[PDB]
């Protein structure tokens, strides 16, 4: 995958975070209506500082749900969450139209990487 695991660009990081969150959720609850993407893509971009902290609540709940089962992937995700977030000093208030584009890129690269076996 074209994913660069050492970019360290804040919007890129954010997009990767988003993707991982989505994947986690997906694993947690088979047969769901839709994705996280569908519900909160817009908002995230609009106002990163207001939504991420809510997303991380649900993340935990999902992980909890998962881990109890033999499918203890979900520990592997949590480590990634650790790593990603580690590099971030604070959440942005607003994002330019430009870094919005960047944001997207990061998302996609990470998405494909997760789907790899």
């Amino acid at each position: 995958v074209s994913l660069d695991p050492a970019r360290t660009d804040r919007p890129y990081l954010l997009g990767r975070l988003f993707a991982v969150l989505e994947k986690a959720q997906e694993d947690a609850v088979p047969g769901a209506n839709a994705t996280i993407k569908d519900r909160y893509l817009a908002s995230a971009s609009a106002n990163p500082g207001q939504v991420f902290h809510m997303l991380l609540k649900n993340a935990s709940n999902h992980t909890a749900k998962l881990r109890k089962d033999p499918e203890r992937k979900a520990i592997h995700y949590e480590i990634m969450m650790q790593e990603i977030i580690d590099n971030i000093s604070d959440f942005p208030v607003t994002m330019s139209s430009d870094e919005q584009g960047l944001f997207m890129i990061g998302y996609y690269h990470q998405r494909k990487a997760l789907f790899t076996k």
Partner: protein, 286 residues
């Protein structure tokens, strides 16, 4: 019929609780928001709809107070009715080639229909009676603070269709806003009013509609909504005595002392109004 003789400006305030004020028909059905800032938005069309509803409810077909049967009607029929009512042969694409009767196929409308008299309409349609501009205009509504839409899940007893796959049989969604406070602006023009006859009694009825708009609107999804404030500026001559933007600046909204993080009631806010120039009259008690 005697038109008004002064220019007007006004400001309106309202809020919501655990409701969807106006659903976006493209974004699933989520509330409308500012993509850049997260501020909420409300279309003026919505408001006008509400006002028309209230007028129809309260007057109930009184003369000169018809509402253009806006619900599910074939609009072009009323135009040929104006033509035939004016004794003019209906013209699909064009107005009559006769100034007086040409305008009459519209003046009949103005006499009959209140909402046409107030907002105007496009009437160059497949039956042509012309155009109207409307003496009353409004802009978009904007929240004073960012909003955070929420979504919830629903079960179901039963199945609509032949779902033979064969508990809790179905999911469903709802979209809500915990809290929010909104503002709006509006204008009234006398020179245009002279062209349609929008008169004082109509203005009073309009004020009443604004005060009591929400009371008859209860629905499942609507939640709880109400109006809070209303300030009216009245110039002293047919053309105003000050710019509009200066007037709207006299009203200011801010957090109460007890900020306490998330806002959840009207009580959280403080509202104040300045003092107007000499040529403008301020009445706010409405």
């Amino acid at each position: 019929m005697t038109a008004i003789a002064n220019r007007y400006e006004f400001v309106l305030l309202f809020d919501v609780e655990n409701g969807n004020p106006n659903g976006d028909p493209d974004a699933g059905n989520m509330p409308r928001i500012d993509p850049e800032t997260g501020h909420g938005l409300v279309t003026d069309v919505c408001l006008k709809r509400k006002i028309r509803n209230h007028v129809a409810l309260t007057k109930e077909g009184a003369e000169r107070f018809n509402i253009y049967i806006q619900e599910k009607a074939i609009l072009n029929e009323t135009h040929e009715r104006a033509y035939t009512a004016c004794d003019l042969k209906p013209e699909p694409k064009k107005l009559p080639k006769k100034v007086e009767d040409a305008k009459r196929v519209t003046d009949w409308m103005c006499t009959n229909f209140y909402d046409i008299r107030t907002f105007g309409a496009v009437m160059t349609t497949e039956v042509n009676c012309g155009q109207v501009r409307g003496p009353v205009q409004m802009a978009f509504a904007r929240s004073v603070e960012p909003v955070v839409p929420q979504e919830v899940s629903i079960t179901r007893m039963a199945v609509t269709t032949k779902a033979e796959a064969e508990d809790n049989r179905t999911m469903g969604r709802k979209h809500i806003v915990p809290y929010g406070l909104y503002v709006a602006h509006g204008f009234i023009s006398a020179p245009l009013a002279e062209k349609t006859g929008f008169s004082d009694e109509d203005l009073t009825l309009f004020w009443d509609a604004l005060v009591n708009m929400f009371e008859h609107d209860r629905s499942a999804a609507r939640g709880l909504m109400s109006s809070r404030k209303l300030i009216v500026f009245k110039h002293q001559n047919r053309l105003g005595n000050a710019p509009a933007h200066k007037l709207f600046d006299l009203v200011k909204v801010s957090r109460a002392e007890g900020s306490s993080g998330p806002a959840r009631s009207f009580a959280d806010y403080a509202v104040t109004v300045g003092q107007a120039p000499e040529g403008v009259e301020v009445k706010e008690m409405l």
